[PDB]
Design a protein around this ligand. Structure first.
Ligand SMILES: CSc1cccc(CN2C[C@H](C(N)=O)CCC2=O)c1
Ligand SMILES: [Zn+2]
Length: 140
């Protein structure tokens, strides 16, 4: 579990969105496993606007924050899971590291702010959905 709170927006994994997130939907993309909903209170997170390939992510299944090198956002084949059939997931970055399904929502951050959230994993890899291209998260 986990979310990014920036301005009046809440960014969550699309598969973990609640009834309130869908009722207050701003934007969602099944191919990215992302959903953004509106909030009444202002958030304090800052989204990174950079091309960083090193950062730290939180892994709840180990209660640990791991420093990682990650690939640039790409279209990657992702095996079938409890929430999606086998498909290509877009804007996805991979790192070598631990992840389990319940780790989705864990933040990946670099020196510039939030880069993305855990979305995939398996075989000693962890994948993160990028949010740095969603420039509109910074305004209105
Ligand atoms: C096998 S370890 C692992 C870690 C994180 C996630 C998964 C599987 N998965 C991937 C889904 C997607 N984004 O396509 C989102 C929901 C989900 O449970 C496995
Ligand atoms: Zn950065």
């Amino acid at each position: 579990s986990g979310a990014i709170y920036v301005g009046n927006y809440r960014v969550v994994n699309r598969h973990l969105a609640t009834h309130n997130d869908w009722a207050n939907l701003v934007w969602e993309d099944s191919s990215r496993d992302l959903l953004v909903s509106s909030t009444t209170a202002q958030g304090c997170d800052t989204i990174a606007r950079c091309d960083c390939q090193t950062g730290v992510y939180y892994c709840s299944s180990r209660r640990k924050h791991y420093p990682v090198s990650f690939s640039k956002p790409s279209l990657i084949f992702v095996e079938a899971s409890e929430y999606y059939p086998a498909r290509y997931q877009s804007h996805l970055m991979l790192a070598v590291g631990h992840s389990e399904p319940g780790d989705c929502g864990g933040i990946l951050r670099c020196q510039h702010g939030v880069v993305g959230i855990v979305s995939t994993g398996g075989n000693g890899l962890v994948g993160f959905a990028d949010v740095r291209d969603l420039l509109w998260l910074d305004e209105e």
